[PDB]
Design an enzyme around this catalytic site. Structure first.
Site, PDB file in Angstrom:
ATOM      1  N   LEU A  90       0.818  -1.215   0.000  1.00  0.00           N
ATOM      2  CA  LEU A  90       0.000   0.000   0.000  1.00  0.00           C
ATOM      3  C   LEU A  90       0.849   1.261   0.000  1.00  0.00           C
ATOM      4  O   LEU A  90       0.434   2.310  -0.505  1.00  0.00           O
ATOM      5  CB  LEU A  90      -0.935   0.021   1.209  1.00  0.00           C
ATOM      6  N   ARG A 103       5.030   3.063   1.470  1.00  0.00           N
ATOM      7  CA  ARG A 103       6.265   2.927   2.209  1.00  0.00           C
ATOM      8  C   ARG A 103       6.723   4.273   2.738  1.00  0.00           C
ATOM      9  O   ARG A 103       6.544   5.305   2.088  1.00  0.00           O
ATOM     10  CB  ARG A 103       7.349   2.301   1.332  1.00  0.00           C
ATOM     11  N   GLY A 104       7.301   4.253   3.931  1.00  0.00           N
ATOM     12  CA  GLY A 104       7.914   5.436   4.499  1.00  0.00           C
ATOM     13  C   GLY A 104       9.399   5.205   4.696  1.00  0.00           C
ATOM     14  O   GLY A 104       9.928   4.165   4.298  1.00  0.00           O
ATOM     15  N   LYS A 105      10.064   6.180   5.310  1.00  0.00           N
ATOM     16  CA  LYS A 105      11.480   6.091   5.667  1.00  0.00           C
ATOM     17  C   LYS A 105      11.769   4.829   6.476  1.00  0.00           C
ATOM     18  O   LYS A 105      12.849   4.238   6.395  1.00  0.00           O
ATOM     19  CB  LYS A 105      11.889   7.330   6.479  1.00  0.00           C
ATOM     20  N   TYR A 106      10.745   4.404   7.199  1.00  0.00           N
ATOM     21  CA  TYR A 106      10.845   3.567   8.381  1.00  0.00           C
ATOM     22  C   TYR A 106      10.227   2.173   8.205  1.00  0.00           C
ATOM     23  O   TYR A 106      10.504   1.251   8.979  1.00  0.00           O
ATOM     24  CB  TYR A 106      10.148   4.296   9.536  1.00  0.00           C
ATOM     25  N   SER A 107       9.381   2.024   7.194  1.00  0.00           N
ATOM     26  CA  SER A 107       8.574   0.818   7.087  1.00  0.00           C
ATOM     27  C   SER A 107       7.892   0.700   5.738  1.00  0.00           C
ATOM     28  O   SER A 107       7.882   1.634   4.940  1.00  0.00           O
ATOM     29  CB  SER A 107       7.522   0.799   8.194  1.00  0.00           C
ATOM     30  N   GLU A 108       7.314  -0.466   5.493  1.00  0.00           N
ATOM     31  CA  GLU A 108       6.444  -0.657   4.352  1.00  0.00           C
ATOM     32  C   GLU A 108       5.114  -1.210   4.843  1.00  0.00           C
ATOM     33  O   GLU A 108       5.058  -1.972   5.805  1.00  0.00           O
ATOM     34  CB  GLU A 108       7.077  -1.591   3.328  1.00  0.00           C
ATOM     35  N   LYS A 154       2.328  -3.586   8.860  1.00  0.00           N
ATOM     36  CA  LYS A 154       3.400  -2.603   8.714  1.00  0.00           C
ATOM     37  C   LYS A 154       4.707  -3.252   9.129  1.00  0.00           C
ATOM     38  O   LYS A 154       4.908  -3.567  10.302  1.00  0.00           O
ATOM     39  CB  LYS A 154       3.109  -1.356   9.558  1.00  0.00           C
ATOM     40  N   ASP A 173       1.840  13.774  14.745  1.00  0.00           N
ATOM     41  CA  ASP A 173       1.812  13.676  13.286  1.00  0.00           C
ATOM     42  C   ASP A 173       0.386  13.726  12.770  1.00  0.00           C
ATOM     43  O   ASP A 173      -0.005  12.955  11.892  1.00  0.00           O
ATOM     44  CB  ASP A 173       2.502  12.391  12.823  1.00  0.00           C
TER      45      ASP A 173
HETATM   46  N1  LIG Z   1      -6.003   0.130   8.596  1.00  0.00           N
HETATM   47  C1  LIG Z   1      -5.654   0.647   7.308  1.00  0.00           C
HETATM   48  O1  LIG Z   1      -6.441   0.491   6.386  1.00  0.00           O
HETATM   49  C2  LIG Z   1      -4.325   1.349   7.075  1.00  0.00           C
HETATM   50  N2  LIG Z   1      -3.535   1.511   8.164  1.00  0.00           N
HETATM   51  C3  LIG Z   1      -2.284   2.114   8.032  1.00  0.00           C
HETATM   52  C4  LIG Z   1      -1.427   2.327   9.274  1.00  0.00           C
HETATM   53  C5  LIG Z   1      -0.084   2.722   9.211  1.00  0.00           C
HETATM   54  C6  LIG Z   1       0.686   2.959  10.366  1.00  0.00           C
HETATM   55  C7  LIG Z   1       0.156   2.845  11.656  1.00  0.00           C
HETATM   56  C8  LIG Z   1       1.059   3.092  12.883  1.00  0.00           C
HETATM   57  O2  LIG Z   1       2.289   3.018  12.630  1.00  0.00           O
HETATM   58  O3  LIG Z   1       0.555   3.347  14.011  1.00  0.00           O
HETATM   59  C9  LIG Z   1      -1.178   2.469  11.748  1.00  0.00           C
HETATM   60  C10 LIG Z   1      -1.949   2.225  10.583  1.00  0.00           C
HETATM   61  N3  LIG Z   1      -1.819   2.609   6.841  1.00  0.00           N
HETATM   62  C11 LIG Z   1      -2.617   2.442   5.742  1.00  0.00           C
HETATM   63  C12 LIG Z   1      -3.910   1.804   5.789  1.00  0.00           C
HETATM   64  N4  LIG Z   1      -4.502   1.775   4.499  1.00  0.00           N
HETATM   65  C13 LIG Z   1      -3.579   2.384   3.703  1.00  0.00           C
HETATM   66  O4  LIG Z   1      -3.698   2.594   2.364  1.00  0.00           O
HETATM   67  N5  LIG Z   1      -2.391   2.828   4.380  1.00  0.00           N
HETATM   68  C14 LIG Z   1      -1.226   3.511   3.810  1.00  0.00           C
HETATM   69  C15 LIG Z   1      -1.281   4.134   2.554  1.00  0.00           C
HETATM   70  C16 LIG Z   1      -0.157   4.783   2.025  1.00  0.00           C
HETATM   71  C17 LIG Z   1       1.044   4.833   2.733  1.00  0.00           C
HETATM   72  C18 LIG Z   1       1.104   4.218   3.981  1.00  0.00           C
HETATM   73  C19 LIG Z   1      -0.014   3.566   4.521  1.00  0.00           C
END
Ligand SMILES: NC(=O)c1nc(-c2ccc(C(=O)O)cc2)nc2c1[nH]c(=O)n2-c1ccccc1
EC number: 2.7.11.1
Length: 334
Positions: free
Chosen positions: A44, A46-51, A67, A155
């Site tokens: 879905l 990616r960041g600096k830190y994770s995918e 994640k 954030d």
């Molecule tokens: N539940 C979802 O549907 C959901 N949850 C997260 C999510 C991430 C981090 C954390 C955290 O680190 O606390 C919690 C939740 N990220 C999501 C997501 N659906 C989605 O397209 N992304 C996304 C899209 C583009 C780039 C990055 C992430």
């Protein structure tokens, strides 16, 4: 003669009066679930830190989001896990459903409830005045909760507020920058997206608190009711404060600086120039006026203030007349 210290005017000592194990995330021992319960379906982002991946829980065939953490500081991983566990079950807080590791490679992953979030170009074209009030209220529930639980999100931005509009469902996500508030603690000002950074971060004032999140929320509100995302659009951190000052005015900025004995980079004064405080009405046009009311503007004006001690708390925000119709309608016995 350095900067004047500051402390939160609400929830100041919530971590002080809790057991060490609540806020001492380094001492936290993780119980790991089973990596083989989850199958990755598609990436879905990616960041600096994770995918981050869409995934399936193969034990019950439910969608989840996984994640996977790149090999960063073990400290930051434990911090995020502890915060997510502490806040689990809170209103509109994303649910951490599982934590897994590769037993062989030792790479950890966080497993979250899936949110089917609405496209955005779709939301931008159909969110009504009521919709915005409703979702703002729901965000405030989340922020009052985590703040009452001694945690700053740090954030808050539209991408970290997922909305599944057809189920009127909202979740505050990405707790990777979140941190426990301890009074007198100096924090890293390199948090939040540029567009949602409060003035305290932009002038390198480190002793900030929960009110940082309220600035970010105000930026989101402005973006939504004026239909300009992001509302303050700087091209770097210096320019970001210039964009704020062009709206809020330089006089109140310099009063803020003066009150806390903050010292600015000499170059800042040259680029900040001199700007009147504008009326919020300036940003109302035929295209957005249906989302703007006197109540909305009064509310906004009480969020977007330079002095972090002056901003509404999340609780105070929820009491504002802007939410009268929403609060009525949510008084449900189900
Ligand atoms: N539940 C979802 O549907 C959901 N949850 C997260 C999510 C991430 C981090 C954390 C955290 O680190 O606390 C919690 C939740 N990220 C999501 C997501 N659906 C989605 O397209 N992304 C996304 C899209 C583009 C780039 C990055 C992430």
């Amino acid at each position: 003669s350095g900067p004047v210290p500051s402390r939160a005017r609400v929830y100041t000592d919530v971590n002080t009066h809790r057991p060490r194990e609540y806020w001492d995330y380094e001492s936290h021992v993780v119980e790991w679930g089973n990596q083989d319960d989850y199958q990755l379906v598609r990436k879905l982002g990616r960041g600096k830190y994770s995918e981050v991946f869409e995934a399936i829980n193969i034990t019950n065939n439910e969608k989840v989001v996984v994640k996977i953490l790149k090999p960063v500081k073990k400290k930051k991983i434990k911090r995020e896990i502890k915060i997510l566990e502490n806040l689990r079950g809170g209103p509109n807080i994303i649910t951490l459903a599982d934590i897994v590791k590769d037993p062989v490679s030792r790479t950890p992953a966080l497993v979250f409830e899936h949110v089917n979030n609405t496209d955005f170009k779709q939301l931008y074209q159909t969110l009504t005045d009521y919709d915005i009030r409703f979702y703002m209220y729901e965000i405030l529930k989340a922020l009052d909760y985590c703040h009452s639980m001694g945690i700053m999100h740090r954030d808050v931005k539209p991408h970290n507020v997922m909305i599944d509009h057809e189920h009127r469902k909202l979740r505050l996500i990405d707790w990777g920058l979140a941190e426990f508030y301890h009074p007198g603690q100096e924090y890293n000002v390199r948090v939040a997206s540029r567009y949602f950074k409060g003035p305290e971060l932009l002038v390198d004032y480190q002793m900030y608190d929960y009110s940082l999140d309220m600035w970010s929320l105000g930026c989101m509100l402005a973006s939504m009711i004026f239909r300009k995302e992001p509302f303050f659009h700087g091209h770097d951190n210096y320019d970001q404060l210039v964009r704020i000052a062009k709206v809020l005015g330089t006089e109140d900025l310099y009063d803020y600086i003066d009150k806390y004995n903050i010292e600015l980079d000499p170059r800042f004064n040259d680029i900040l120039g001199r700007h009147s405080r504008k009326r919020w009405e300036r940003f109302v046009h035929s295209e957005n006026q249906h989302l703007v009311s006197p109540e909305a503007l009064d509310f906004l004006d009480k969020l977007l203030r330079y002095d972090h001690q002056s901003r509404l708390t999340a609780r105070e925000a929820m009491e504002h007349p802007y939410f009268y119709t929403v609060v009525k309608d949510q008084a449900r016995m189900g």
